[PDB]
Amino acid sequence: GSSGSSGLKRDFIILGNGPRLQNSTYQCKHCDSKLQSTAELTSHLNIHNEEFQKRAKRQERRKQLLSKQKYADGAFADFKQESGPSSG
């Protein structure tokens, strides 16, 4: 109280591709991050749980898109990914 000043305003920055290449990195399936190894994932994940506990509010719209997936039958008893053509 008994004051009158301000100073709260900043910006963010997101950029960094580089020709670098992935190296034994862990591509999380929750935030799409990159960890060194499980040792880090085991902990990193835990974060999600906590973040979900709070984030889990009385939201209104709750839905999730689907991920179509194809497969081959093959006459001869066999099953292989045989990833189809890259639609693009």
Q: Which residues bind Zn ion (CB under 5 A)?
A: 28, 30-31, 33
Between 38 and 72, whose beta carbon lies closer to Zn ion? Answer: 38
> Of 33 and 74, which has the nearer Cβ to Zn ion?
33
Q: In angstroms, give the least distance from the CB of 2 to Zn ion.
A: 46
Q: Residue 28 CB, nearest distance to Zn ion (Å)?
A: 3
Return d(Cα 32, Cα 29) in angstroms, integer.
6
Give least dist CB 55 to Zn ion, A: 13
In the numeric block, which tokens belong to residue 20? 């670098």
Q: Which amino acid is at 5?
A: S
- How far, CA to CA in Å, does 5 sit from each of 1, 28, 73? 11, 43, 71
